[PDB]
Nucleic acid binder design. Sequence first.
RNA 1: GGAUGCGAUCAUACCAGCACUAAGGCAUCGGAUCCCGUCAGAACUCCGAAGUUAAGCGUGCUUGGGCGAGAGUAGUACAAGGAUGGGUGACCUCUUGGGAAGUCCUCGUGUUGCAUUCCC
RNA 2: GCAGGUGUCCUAAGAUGAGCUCAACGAGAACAGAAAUCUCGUGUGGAACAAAAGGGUAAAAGCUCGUUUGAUUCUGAUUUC
RNA 3: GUUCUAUCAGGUAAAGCCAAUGAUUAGAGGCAUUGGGGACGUCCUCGACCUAUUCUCAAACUUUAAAUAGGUAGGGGCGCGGCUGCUUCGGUGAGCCGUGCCAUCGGGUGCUCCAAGUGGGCCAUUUUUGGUAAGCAGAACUGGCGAUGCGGGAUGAACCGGAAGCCGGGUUACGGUGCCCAACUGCGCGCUAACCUAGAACCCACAAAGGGUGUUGGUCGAUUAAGACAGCAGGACGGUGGUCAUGGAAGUCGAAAUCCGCUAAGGAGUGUGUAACAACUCACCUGCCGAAUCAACUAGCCCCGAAAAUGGAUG
RNA 4: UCCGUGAUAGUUUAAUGGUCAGAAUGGGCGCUUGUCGCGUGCCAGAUCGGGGUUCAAUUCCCCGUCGCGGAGCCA
Lengths: 170, 184, 304, 164
Amino acid sequence: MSTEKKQLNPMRDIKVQKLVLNISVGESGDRLTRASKVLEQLSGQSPVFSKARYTVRSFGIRRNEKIACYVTIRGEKAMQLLESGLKVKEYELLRRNFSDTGCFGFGIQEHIDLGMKYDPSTGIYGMDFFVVLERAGYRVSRRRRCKARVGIHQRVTKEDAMKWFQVKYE
Amino acid sequence: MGRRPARCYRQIKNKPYPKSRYCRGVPDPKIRIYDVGMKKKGVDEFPYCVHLVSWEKENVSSEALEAARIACNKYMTKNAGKDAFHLRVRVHPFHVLRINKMLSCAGADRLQTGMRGAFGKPQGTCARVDIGQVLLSVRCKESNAKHAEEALRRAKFKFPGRQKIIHSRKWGFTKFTREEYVKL
Amino acid sequence: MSLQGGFVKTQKTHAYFKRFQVKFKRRRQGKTDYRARIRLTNQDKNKYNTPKYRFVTNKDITAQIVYATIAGDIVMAAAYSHELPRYGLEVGLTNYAAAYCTGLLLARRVLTLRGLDQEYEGNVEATGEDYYVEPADERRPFRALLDVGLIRTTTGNRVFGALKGALDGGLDIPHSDKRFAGFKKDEKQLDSDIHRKYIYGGHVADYMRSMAEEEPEKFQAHFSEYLKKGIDADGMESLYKKVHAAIRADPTMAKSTKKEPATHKRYNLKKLTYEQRKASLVERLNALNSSAGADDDDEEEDDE
Amino acid sequence: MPAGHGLRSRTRDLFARPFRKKGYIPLTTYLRTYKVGEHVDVKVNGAVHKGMPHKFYHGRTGRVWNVTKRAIGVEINKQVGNRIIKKRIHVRVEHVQPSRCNEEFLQRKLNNDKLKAEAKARGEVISTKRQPAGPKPGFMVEGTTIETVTPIPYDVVNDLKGGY
RNA sequence: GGAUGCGAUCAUACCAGCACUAAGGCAUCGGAUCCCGUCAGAACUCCGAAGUUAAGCGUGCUUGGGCGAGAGUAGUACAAGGAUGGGUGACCUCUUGGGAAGUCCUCGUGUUGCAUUCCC
RNA sequence: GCAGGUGUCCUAAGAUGAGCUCAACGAGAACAGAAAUCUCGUGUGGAACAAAAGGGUAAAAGCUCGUUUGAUUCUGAUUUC
RNA sequence: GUUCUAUCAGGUAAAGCCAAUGAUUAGAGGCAUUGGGGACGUCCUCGACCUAUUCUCAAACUUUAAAUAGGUAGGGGCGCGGCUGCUUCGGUGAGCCGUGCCAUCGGGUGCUCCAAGUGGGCCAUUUUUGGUAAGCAGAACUGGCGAUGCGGGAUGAACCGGAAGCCGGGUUACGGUGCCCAACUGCGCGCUAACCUAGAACCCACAAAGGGUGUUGGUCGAUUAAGACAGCAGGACGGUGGUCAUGGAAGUCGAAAUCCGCUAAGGAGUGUGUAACAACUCACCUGCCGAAUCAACUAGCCCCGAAAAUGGAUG
RNA sequence: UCCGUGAUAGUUUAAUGGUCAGAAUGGGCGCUUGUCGCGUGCCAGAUCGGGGUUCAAUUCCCCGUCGCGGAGCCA
């Protein structure tokens, strides 16, 4: 329903909902969740434990147990992450990783970034940095009481996404 | 095939069970193909339908559905070929015959004592072909109507419940052939 | 074509449907829970409704006293923080002191001593006080209970200040003190236990003295000056106004009013049928043409 | 197998609701409180799971006899068989519906008596109906309650149904 | 003529789409030292007006597919009572009191009770 | 007679309150297929409730979190039996 | 107890659930390997298999809406005054007591004591569930037998009439009126000739799928004195021994193809042929004859299918 | 035909508490030995067919094919 043709912006322009940096490997294969250390450094705040629910067929009977780790960041902290993260995968590159929904994600070792290797006791190769982009009004699908779906009208587009991010430092 | 004669199962008399997910061990259905002829067309080139309609509401045996069809089907191919018009058989074999099977010969037959006693191993199935239902529905083009008519006449000597041939029409073939070209 | 979203709804209609008539407009809007509603309503104590978030929020608050009847609920009194500057006050209408005073204003307004029928003894006013742990006479609460609505039991919080303004207002509302916004948390004086501060009117006072630029008109004591004017006794309002001209009106209302069906569906259908017979391509949603004349009918004639 | 009364056995209206009645019931039914001598249906909402009587009772109309906390006692009489007694049923107001028939009736009674007063100060119809009412001694009721609950232990249907 | 709170009727109250509570009778919105909270004010929440009408809340319309309700169009199924009524029979039938159904047209993209009460 | 369950298992698999709302599908994430995980959008009872069937319920009765002990003693009008 | 309200059996179209199985149109996207190509100084496209989604034809659980139908439920008021309650030293009614006032049936009927066979049924009708079925088994709802005469059904526990003190007379019910046997060899009309056939119901009275130019009857189409239908009789040259195919068609194994000159009529032919070659009839047309004909639907009865045991019957 | 009773690798035959399966022989590979054999190190199962219950079934139910035992009167 994209209504652009008016007299526009400041509510329309994109913002960062979140950056989630998530590891998926498992326990035992590298450790407890020790690339939490590496997350800890790159992002700047502590990652939180990922448990699983549902199926595996492959070892992974324990269910409730540590297997993964994540950092959902946002404000300045997400952006500050983007700046370092944004520059490492090369550019430019590419429409395919963007969804139509207007989010984009990439992989690489935590060791990419400025950072000491020396502090991370382990490095671990890859897992999604995910960037959630959205308009101001999101708060309607998010907030509890008066949830309303986000309309086609509101929802970010890959074109819109590429533009706002391509606007900045890549 | 191995005997039980169909009169016993002819009457619409007992409660209707066709439920496959509870009724375990249910054997092969038939007819092997229900609509016979083309299948590159639907009704188009065939501006005549002929039907066989039941006078008598009854349970018709699964093999009788094949037997009535096969006599009709050779008349179709032996007088109008492989990829001709299209016939449809339109009542199908819902009614699972459980019913006493496998008798023995002591002073037991009924093996446990005399009993017998449901959880019977299944024998076959019948179709409920009720009054005025269209058992066979055949779309044809007019010169070959008389060919479908002998084929329906051969069909009726091979099920129990008496039927009449009719050239079938809903909106004629003469409100269709107006209403078609009035809204284009 | 493909396509998602619509298609996974329009087929599974019957489900839809059910989703809109399981609950109605205040739940569809997402406003009122009908399990908290039932907890609080069954007894005839009235609902002491105090809204404050995704509603009226970050700007004003309201307290309403609601009873049941055959027609619908029925508010017996209400107070809005926007009426609170009438009694002199001009500092912020969303804060703890505003909420506190808005609850007194509803509570003073509900007795106000009404109707022939009266009631101001044993002992309304319980002053604009300062306060300690609820002094009543004293043991049984009735004719108001707190309907927090969507708003939380979050320990030491502004819904409780509204509740405290009810209590020091001559309403008696049920209580025990173990998540509550106690005494100084309006401001008042305080404090005890595992929860903390021992200031909160007087919030902003602590802040303001940590220097920086913000709102005009001073300081910590300006809570005290016009909490003190809201300690005075002075029922009741609202209001005197001139009524009302003719008619309705309004330029917004007008460029919206009124009706138009039938006729307008007939003008639009005429436009559609003329648009078809002058071209023939697609209809409205989504397909057909060869060659039509409205509506369900056209599709049946384009098969055979 | 002996017969019983599987208290939960055969239940499709008695617990299912139409498409139009599905989902949570609005709490106004849960809130509704009645006065003694109200005539109220018993007929469960199926979408409330507690406070229900034993399912056979549903579609009978009872008199509100007394109340205990939250649920109410409503008096009903069982039906069919032999010598059957009044029984009292404990039911919350979620399954108990006010009789509109009884309200309509109450109204139709007042209408009748507005006219009785008018037509006895300047009007004429009946005469004979004026002769009973005016005499009577009244009143309420429990002699005639025991009178009610002795022929509804019915007579000839009991012998008729007592063999076949 | 009506937006803002609490609700009744809970498939006439939808999915979808187009105008509007609004220069001092909202929500988006800004500060997050804070009570509160999170992993992370995003939610949550003390605080609060610079912007916005762009929404949400909700207001004028759109029946489009959905359906309540009804109008014609399918008296057809079905069934209660009764027949030395018919039929070899499964079965039918008259009489007595009753009678869904699909299509098309239609109405309908709310209604109602208490509030705060408002621009004209 | 058809169809199929209970003779266990549970101090949390109870209680309450705040706070949340699905299953699932598409789209996105180097590697992973079982791949969880992490995200977004759509999402009304199709999920979830130990256990048959069945029926029920969406700020819940379901989810999450803390706390708690009422699986306390004694009495019972009445329904089932 | 009809009328008011409730809500409910119930099972067809639709919805969720699910559907065997076969009959599928349009059209997006999965997967796999292979093949082909222009476009341009790889791309992109196409093809070989699967699934969305538009979606037709047919039963099956739940729900609509049942329609239904029986069920099945139900048929005093006011004021005054005291006292009370639950739920803010807070709002209210309700309860209670006291006192006054004002208001289509028709004994089908309540309570108590003490006693009985039981505490094993049957059948019919309706609705069923099992069972091939059964004078089966097992329920539901009812009427009867049991425990019910008398009259009809040849006889006959439960079908019909009918519920009975005894007797007398009258009239009837069911059912019947040729004789046996009271009472019609009744009236108007029509069908059947098989001794069909003398029969509601019955373990008891059989008769089917299917067939029948027997006969009657109803209807519709076409053909008719611009002469029909049938029969009998009579006319048909030439292209050219029709093109294919094949020992061979050549009218006449099989398969093109079916026109015309010359004509008033006159088809490249209807059945009979010899290994193959050998003739006759016939399409169409005409006469003779003179009146209805033919086609087709529908229906009745009858006929057929129709074989069993000591001796023939609808009593 | 009724009541009882079993089955696990090529073959004969152990075993469990619901989360874990063996042995011996036979056989497949080396070494003995001139060569085989005697002997000596090494190795290797859809627990009968079948469906169900459960967090997890070789193990707990139900059915069946086979192989067993034990009954079957008064004619």
